[PDB]
Design a protein around this ligand. Structure first.
Ligand SMILES: *[C@@H]1O[C@H](CO)[C@@H](O)[C@H](O)[C@H]1NC(C)=O
Lengths: 48, 49
């Protein structure tokens, strides 16, 4: 016999933080002896 | 591109001066040579060598 109006809220996730990782800097940041062996693989960081 | 690091501009070196010598040669060249059954031990700390 009588009515009103109710309001509701809803959130849907759409975006995401674009995370970029420097594989060479993460493994062999400032060590040349580390890079001399990380370049022996290379393709791991490349694919990452 | 690949990462980089800022190159150092100077060098910091800190040591404690006025320290006596360890004198390990006076302990190794001692006339009293022990045996493996009663081997001796001497600890050297706070000295220069
Ligand atoms: C050997 O060590 C003893 C014990 O400290 C010392 O009395 C003696 O002078 C030493 N001898 C030599 C030749 O260093």
């Amino acid at each position: 016999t009588n009515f009103t109006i109710a309001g509701h809220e809803e959130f849907i996730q759409t975006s995401s933080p674009k995370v970029t990782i420097d594989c060479s800097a993460f493994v062999c940041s400032n060590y040349a002896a580390c890079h001399d062996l990380l370049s022996e693989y290379g393709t791991f960081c490349d694919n990452i | 591109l690949s990462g980089f690091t800022v190159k150092p501009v100077a060098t910091v070196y800190r040591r404690i001066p006025n320290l006596p010598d360890c004198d390990i040669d006076n302990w190794l060249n001692n006339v009293s040579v022990p045996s493996p059954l009663n081997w001796e031990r001497r600890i050297f700390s706070n000295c220069n060598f």
